Design a protein around this nucleic acid. Structure first.
Ligand code: FES
Ligand SMILES: [K+]
Ligand SMILES: [K+]
Ligand SMILES: [K+]
Ligand SMILES: [K+]
Ligand SMILES: [K+]
Ligand SMILES: [Mg+2]
Ligand SMILES: [Mg+2]
Ligand SMILES: [Mg+2]
Ligand SMILES: [Mg+2]
Ligand SMILES: [Mg+2]
Ligand SMILES: [Mg+2]
Ligand SMILES: [Mg+2]
Ligand SMILES: [Mg+2]
Ligand SMILES: [Mg+2]
Ligand SMILES: [Mg+2]
Ligand SMILES: [Mg+2]
Ligand SMILES: [Mg+2]
Ligand SMILES: [Mg+2]
Ligand SMILES: [Mg+2]
Ligand SMILES: [Mg+2]
Lengths: 126, 50, 170, 113, 216
RNA sequence: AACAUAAUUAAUUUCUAGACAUCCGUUUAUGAGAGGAGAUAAGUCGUGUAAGCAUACUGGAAAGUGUGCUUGGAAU
RNA sequence: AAAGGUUUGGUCCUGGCCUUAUAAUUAAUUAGAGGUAAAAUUACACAUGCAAACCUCCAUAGACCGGUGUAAAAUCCCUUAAACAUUUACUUAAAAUUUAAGGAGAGGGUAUCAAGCACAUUAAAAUAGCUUAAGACACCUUGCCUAGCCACACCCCCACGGGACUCAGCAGUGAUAAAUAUUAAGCAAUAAACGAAAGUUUGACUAAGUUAUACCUCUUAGGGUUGGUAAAUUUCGUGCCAGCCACCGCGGUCAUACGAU
């Protein structure tokens, strides 16, 4: 298609089959389809653990730096991937979500202790 | 490098031009001798024909 | 039997044997040769055998040939700067003519190798995609990675159909 | 002094007509590979060229230079040079007048006329 | 080719359409009219967001304040309730030019220009003011101008340089050793060149779009 | 058709309105009427002046005859 | 093509047709489940629901994604130039994305379409030229260039205007056709839009439903054929009839060729 307006972006293009997702990191005009025309492939992401239990990310860090230097935006999942790698700082919401999960498990642990204490009262009743 | 190769080309053309003049000179000498002999036959035949 | 004389000239292998790749300056190569004579035999053989190979490697160069216009055969190259390189090929074998033009106006082996490598810069083996452009279409092809569900059924717990059933059960 | 967009920055051809004012119709030929036969044949193209002095005659080989701006719809070249004049060829190698595969003036002589 | 033919109707339509737009341009009194009972704009039917409902009933628009002043309040200082609540430091516009919408029966819609002073720092040139049609403006009294505009700058404490990300730092140190540069200096990013304005900083009104004149 | 208002912040208005009403001509088909070439297959009375080609006339219409040509007939 | 069958009284030559391989759609007969991929008569008419929002007002987006193959020999490749309804840096330079003018070369059919009729140059405004059997002009047909691209968006090439007034978005319906997927669930993933942001929205998409159309893994066995080509027939009936064949052919009382077995 003949796009008018838009910018280059670095995003994940979904491949694979049903229940078997696989991603291609690509640089593409933002108005293009998710799996359609791209400019360059900048790596790949396999989100399923392999035989060794490792999720495999490939990053062409030379070309990624080239396209960020030319104005390429980043999708939020790709900003998270660069943070885990260490190439970018950890994303604000990666830290916030980790804090929310910590606060949510603290409640669960406290409730289990309260239930155990309530169960202890049942033990006292016999 | 371009200028050097374009100079070498002109030298090759002059070297080949020198050979051409040497060869053509030899032909003029030989053809001149043949022409003189042929003109003699014409003189003999022309006188006889007259 | 392939028609014509020396039908090997009409094979891609023969056309690719040419080694004269002109510099970007070369734009036109006029060939003046004589069809009759003894000192122009190499020029006639150069038109017969070599001109196809030169055109094959230099598709954008205009090769125009004129016959029996001058006493002797010669080659005149027209460059983009406006320079005109005259070559005299009388009494010269066709092999000699090719070597001469290769030296004066032919790209060197080093330059051609650099261009080939630069052409392939954007092909990466790790890249995934169609066979025309990439070695592997999907990461399932790689050894140790989760295989394609089409070839090998996935475990039930890794399936959305199964996960949805448990959520309903919850 | 930017150059033309056209690919044919320099084209050689034969003057096949000269009936337009200050313009010469020139036929150029290039070699094109037949893919089935793998043999080269001649594809010919017509180029209108600006002949400012009307110094062109039918049958003479000429060199055309691409004009920076097209003079008209079809006139996008000018007459750079007349490589060979029709019937008035001058041998490039020796510099002597020739009439076909023969010298009108011997190269051994030095007429300087 | 040469079978591609002109499209006169398309040419006529484009020009004619553009001409009508210029002739029937809407005015600010129409585009930005509001029905306060429903908080919906009659021209387009757009219902304002929920977080704006309280202020639309509780705050005034800029030219409602300026229409009551001589010379439309040229030289006066005007601030926004949103700024007053968000920023302790003085934020205001010094009005320089004001073009009321004469069509409005109360001269309560129009455009304005001034010099911005945001968070105590003043710009050097006047530019057009954005969000003039908002219910957020508060005229500063003349007797309170001196106390309002009083600001003492604090020394800046936001860091000027920060470390590099963990991987990008190792790639820098690795390249140093490869190239023969021997040093234990820590790579540092410089943040001075790329410091971001606050999100609520006034934007350029001149480069902003205007809504179309086709009613819904 | 495209002016003028304004001007001690500066802007406003203008930035037109007529006229396509519709062709000449152009292609596809319905198809009265009349043939042509086939299909089903038994009828019909005929059929040694060498054959054929071109052409003409005459044959209820295979043919006959004239004129030239050919052997893809025969001829010691 | 590693070929084969089929002109004859016979041989040889020439030459067409057909057989054997591979794939898609439909149909007859038949069929368990599971995983995956694909889903398609029709640019004919459409009931109903949904498919674009966001957000402290302004704006931004709804120009995309998705759909169809309408029109047009329509194109490919390449050059130059300038922009963008953009992005990111500087207050000036790197991109993505387009647009306009072009041309080394390549680019469907009909030549019983052979002429076109202003299709040229000069720049005092004259000259009489321009394309064309190396295929002009005319007509006909077709999406191609395939990580994708191009054109179309109810109809009048366009869309001021007019008309016969909108699903060629998802699902679904009527008619039509040899041709027959859910009027379904979720925005959890990725993509897009918006917002400074927590977030919101999306018939894009994801996970499902449906269907032997294909592949894979398994478990029941069904379908066709049996003169030659070409793997494989016993008895009986029929008697140039009933029927059969892709080609050659078979059937008039000993039919390995038809029907049953
Ligand atoms: S093709 Fe890779 S998962 Fe199916
Ligand atoms: K045969
Ligand atoms: K026969
Ligand atoms: K249309
Ligand atoms: K989602
Ligand atoms: K049977
Ligand atoms: Mg805002
Ligand atoms: Mg006759
Ligand atoms: Mg079916
Ligand atoms: Mg699409
Ligand atoms: Mg069509
Ligand atoms: Mg006809
Ligand atoms: Mg419709
Ligand atoms: Mg339309
Ligand atoms: Mg539908
Ligand atoms: Mg619609
Ligand atoms: Mg089907
Ligand atoms: Mg944003
Ligand atoms: Mg029997
Ligand atoms: Mg049989
Ligand atoms: Mg049987």
């Amino acid at each position: 298609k003949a796009y008018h307006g838009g910018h280059l972006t670095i995003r994940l293009a979904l491949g694979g089959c049903t229940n078997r997702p696989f991603y291609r990191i690509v640089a593409a005009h933002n108005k293009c389809p998710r799996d359609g025309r791209f400019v360059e492939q900048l790596g790949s992401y396999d989100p399923l653990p392999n035989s060794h239990g490792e999720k495999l990310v490939a990053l062409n860090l030379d070309r990624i730096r080239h396209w960020i230097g030319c104005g390429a935006h980043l999708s939020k999942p790709m900003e998270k991937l660069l943070g885990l790698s260490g190439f970018f700082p950890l994303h604000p919401m990666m830290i916030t979500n980790a804090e929310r999960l910590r606060r949510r498990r603290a409640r669960e642990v406290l409730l289990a202790s309260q239930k155990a204490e309530s169960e202890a009262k049942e033990t006292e009743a016999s | 490098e371009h200028r050097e190769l374009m100079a070498w080309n002109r030298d090759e053309n002059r070297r080949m031009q020198e050979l051409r003049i040497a060869r053509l000179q030899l032909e003029a000498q030989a053809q001149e001798v043949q022409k003189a002999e042929a003109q003699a036959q014409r003189a003999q035949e022309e006188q006889a024909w007259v | 039997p392939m028609k014509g004389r020396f039908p090997i000239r009409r094979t891609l292998q023969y056309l690719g044997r040419g080694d004269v790749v002109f510099k970007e300056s070369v734009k036109i190569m006029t060939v003046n040769y004589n069809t009759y004579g003894e000192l122009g035999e190499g020029a006639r053989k150069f038109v017969f055998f070599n001109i196809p190979q030169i055109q094959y490697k230099n598709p954008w160069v205009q090769i125009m040939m004129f016959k029996n216009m001058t006493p002797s055969p010669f080659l005149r190259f027209y460059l983009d700067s406006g320079e005109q390189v005259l070559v005299d090929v009388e009494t010269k074998s066709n092999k000699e003519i090719m070597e001469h033009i290769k030296k004066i106006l032919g790209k060197k082996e080093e330059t051609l190798r650099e261009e080939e490598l630069e052409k392939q810069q954007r092909f990466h083996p790790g890249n995934f995609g169609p066979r025309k452009y990439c070695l592997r279409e999907c990461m399932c092809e790689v050894e140790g990675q989760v295989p394609c569900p089409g070839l090998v059924p996935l475990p039930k717990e890794m399936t959305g159909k199964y996960k949805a059933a448990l959520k309903a059960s919850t | 002094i930017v150059r033309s967009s056209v690919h044919a920055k320099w084209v050689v051809g034969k003057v096949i007509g000269t009936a337009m004012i200050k313009t010469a119709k020139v036929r150029a030929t290039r070699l094109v590979l037949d893919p089935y036969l793998l043999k080269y044949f001649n594809k010919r193209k017509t180029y209108f060229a600006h002949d400012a002095l009307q110094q062109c005659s039918v049958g003479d080989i000429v060199l055309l230079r691409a004009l920076p701006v097209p003079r008209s719809k079809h006139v996008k070249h000018e007459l750079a040079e007349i490589i060979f004049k029709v019937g008035r060829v001058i041998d490039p190698v020796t510099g002597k007048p020739c009439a076909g595969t023969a010298y009108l003036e011997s190269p051994l002589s030095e007429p300087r006329e | 080719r040469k079978k591609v033919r002109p499209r006169l109707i398309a040419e006529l339509a484009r020009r004619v359409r553009a001409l009508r737009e210029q002739r029937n341009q809407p005015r600010d009194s129409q585009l930005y009219a509001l029905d306060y009972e429903t908080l919906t704009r009659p021209h387009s039917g757009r219902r304002l967001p929920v977080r704006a409902w309280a202020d639309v009933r509780r705050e005034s628009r800029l030219l409602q304040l300026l229409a009551r002043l001589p010379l439309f309040g040229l030289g006066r200082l005007v601030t926004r309730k949103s700024w007053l609540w968000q920023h302790d430091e003085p934020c205001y516009w010094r009005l320089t030019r004001v073009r009321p919408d004469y069509t409005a029966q109360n001269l309560d819609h129009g455009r304005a220009w001034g010099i911005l002073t945001f968070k105590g720092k003043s710009e050097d040139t006047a530019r057009e003011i954005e969000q003039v049609m908002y219910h957020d403006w508060r005229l500063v009294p003349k007797h309170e101008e001196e106390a309002f505009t009083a600001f003492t700058a604090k020394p800046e404490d936001r860091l000027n340089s920060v470390p590099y990300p963990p991987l990008l730092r190792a790639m820098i140190l690795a390249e140093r050793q490869k190239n023969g540069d021997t040093s234990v200096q820590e790579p540092l990013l410089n943040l001075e060149r790329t410091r971001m304005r606050p999100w609520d900083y006034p934007a350029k009104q001149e480069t902003k779009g205007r809504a179309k004149g086709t009613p819904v």
